[PDB]
């Protein structure tokens, strides 16, 4: 089981950059990590057979307070992204995910678990908000138990 961590998000934009921190957090631990931010077309020169990839992303809810961490997994992500989550970016990177999944069999098939981490600022600066600094301890928690 070979793991890839894709970070998510907009580090100029406070907690939109929460994804990417976890990602650098995870990087430095030695995980393999890609930054894609908001450009999934960076994953066509990373990506190596991996055959589950860990995507993390700031996002927005209302049914849940900011600082909190959802996961989901499978068909359950767009099922999720439909109504309760929003991810701008991951949204944007859809169609991109899919084009390369057409174009590598080992992608299509490969398990796909989603952390989002609920922003509470994503206005203009680099710093995350208290609330989401905890976000992002429970986001690499839980994606160093993905990646075994």
């Not at 430095?28 to 077309?41: A, H």
């Not at 020169?45 to 700031?58: K, S």
């Not at 989901?72 to 999944?101: C, N, P, Q, T, Y």
Request: glycine share 10%.
């Amino acid at each position: 089981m070979r793991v890839l961590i894709l970070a998510l998000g907009n580090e100029l934009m406070k907690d939109d950059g929460a994804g990417l921190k976890a990602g650098r957090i995870l990087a430095e631990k030695g995980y393999n990590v890609l930054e894609v931010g908001t450009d999934i077309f960076r994953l066509a020169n990373h990506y190596n057979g991996e055959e589950r990839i860990v995507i993390i992303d700031a996002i927005l809810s209302d049914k849940l307070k900011p600082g909190e961490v959802v996961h989901f997994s499978g068909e359950e992500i767009f099922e999720k992204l439909k109504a309760e989550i929003r991810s701008a970016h991951f949204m944007g990177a859809i169609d991109g995910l899919k084009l390369l999944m057409a174009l590598d069999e080992r992608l299509k098939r490969a398990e796909i678990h989603f952390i989002g981490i609920v922003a509470k600022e994503i206005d203009l600066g680099m710093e995350l908000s208290d609330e989401v600094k905890a976000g992002v301890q429970k986001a690499v928690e839980i994606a160093e138990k993905l990646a075994k």
